[PDB]
Scaffold this active site. Structure first.
Site, PDB file in Angstrom:
ATOM      1  CG  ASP A 113       1.506  56.496  -4.898  1.00  0.00           C
ATOM      2  OD1 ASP A 113       1.428  57.411  -3.962  1.00  0.00           O
ATOM      3  OD2 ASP A 113       0.621  55.652  -5.085  1.00  0.00           O
ATOM      4  CG  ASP A 145      -2.944  56.905  -8.396  1.00  0.00           C
ATOM      5  OD1 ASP A 145      -2.053  56.460  -8.834  1.00  0.00           O
ATOM      6  OD2 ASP A 145      -4.005  56.451  -8.070  1.00  0.00           O
ATOM      7  CG  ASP A 202       1.002  54.498  -9.429  1.00  0.00           C
ATOM      8  OD1 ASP A 202       1.017  54.705  -8.115  1.00  0.00           O
ATOM      9  OD2 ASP A 202      -0.153  54.206 -10.183  1.00  0.00           O
TER      10      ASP A 202
END
Ligand code: MG
Ligand code: NA
Ligand code: NA
Length: 325
Positions: free
Chosen positions: A249, A193, A195
């Site tokens: 995110d 992912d 961030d």
DNA sequence: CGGCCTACG
DNA sequence: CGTAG
DNA sequence: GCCG
């Protein structure tokens, strides 16, 4: 070797990779059984090995190391002697471990949901697909996108995502900035992912920013899923002749809090748990991603940098690439 | 023995 | 309940 | 599971 991970440098690559990996399997398995204490000890023991300057070759070298007792030492002894630890291998091949790992890897599924599904007899992703009313919208997205989300995100993917986030952020609030955090800020070349931390140099201007950023990304067709100051998204990322889903995110902080949020969101997870534990237990100060509180004076420390925060806590500064606990 | 990080969606 | 480092 |  100090007892807290925030007291020692931990590089991204190290000299005890196989040993640390084995202890981390046992930590993960403890978490699937709800034993957070045992999880922490195995995580901490693994992290101690990552911080050593050379390979462990003999059991003798564990003497004195923090978080190595009878159990973690036995794991290492078996790996040194035989190249495998029977307990670790039993976990690896167990139906419970494999299924809990598979289910908790789904975005929207935690240990408690995975365990309930396991006890109901479910074992595979197609089992879950065959009863979709039993799933939340979030879990549906996590299952639909699971294959892409299992594919490593590369540093090249990150740079492309950051430019598109910056364009939306710039329209939402001119002057706002976007900082890459998480594992990529610690030097990882891949990850699962991306961030990002967003702020604005004028205190208060960041109020209401994240909805404005999200609506703009969605209008650009980039948002495959989203549900405030934290957004857990799935983004469409271009690929040669197609695209893939990526977890992103987005976090907003006021500039007064930015050093705390940067510190918190850069991790590692274990590093930050250990830093907050150190702060409270050794220094009597309460740390989170918004600030650092003195509960006797009832005052918040002002920080202008991560360096300030390490100084406040009496710790030698560690750059992000040495926070890979 | 108690404690194990501390938030937000 | 889920999410994050 | 380990530390203090
Ligand atoms: Mg991350
Ligand atoms: Na999950
Ligand atoms: Na993340």
């Amino acid at each position: 070797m100090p007892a807290y991970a925030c007291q020692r440098p931990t590089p991204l690559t190290h000299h005890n990779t196989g040993l640390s990996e084995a202890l981390e399997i046992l930590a993960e398995a403890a978490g699937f059984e709800g034993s957070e204490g045992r999880l922490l000890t195995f995580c901490r023991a693994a992290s101690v090995l990552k911080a050593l300057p050379s390979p462990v070759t003999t059991l003798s070298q564990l003497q004195g190391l923090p978080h190595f007792g009878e159990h973690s030492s036995r794991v290492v002894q078996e790996l040194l002697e035989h190249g495998v630890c029977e307990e670790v291998e039993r976990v690896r091949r167990s139906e419970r471990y494999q299924t809990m790992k598979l289910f908790t890897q789904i975005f929207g599924v935690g240990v408690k949901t995975a365990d309930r599904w396991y006890r109901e007899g479910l074992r595979t992703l197609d089992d879950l697909r065959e009863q979709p009313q039993k799933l939340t919208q979030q879990q549906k997205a996590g299952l639909q996108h699971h294959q892409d989300l299992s594919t490593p995100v590369l540093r090249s993917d990150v740079d492309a995502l950051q430019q598109v986030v910056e364009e939306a952020v710039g329209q939402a609030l001119p002057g706002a900035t976007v900082t890459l955090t998480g594992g990529f800020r610690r030097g990882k070349l891949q990850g699962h992912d991306v961030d990002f931390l967003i702020t604005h140099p004028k205190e208060g201007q960041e109020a209401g920013l994240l909805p404005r950023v999200m609506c703009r990304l969605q209008d650009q067709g980039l948002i495959l899923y989203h549900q405030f100051e934290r957004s857990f998204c799935i983004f469409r990322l271009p690929q040669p002749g197609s695209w893939k889903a990526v977890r992103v995110d987005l976090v907003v902080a006021p500039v007064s809090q930015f050093p705390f949020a940067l510190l918190g969101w850069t991790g590692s997870k274990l590093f930050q748990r250990e830093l907050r534990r150190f702060s409270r237990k050794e220094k009597g100060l309460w740390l989170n991603s918004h600030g650092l509180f003195d509960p006797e004076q009832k005052t918040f420390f002002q920080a202008a940098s991560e360096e300030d925060i390490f100084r406040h806590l009496g710790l030698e500064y560690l750059p992000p690439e040495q926070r890979n606990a």
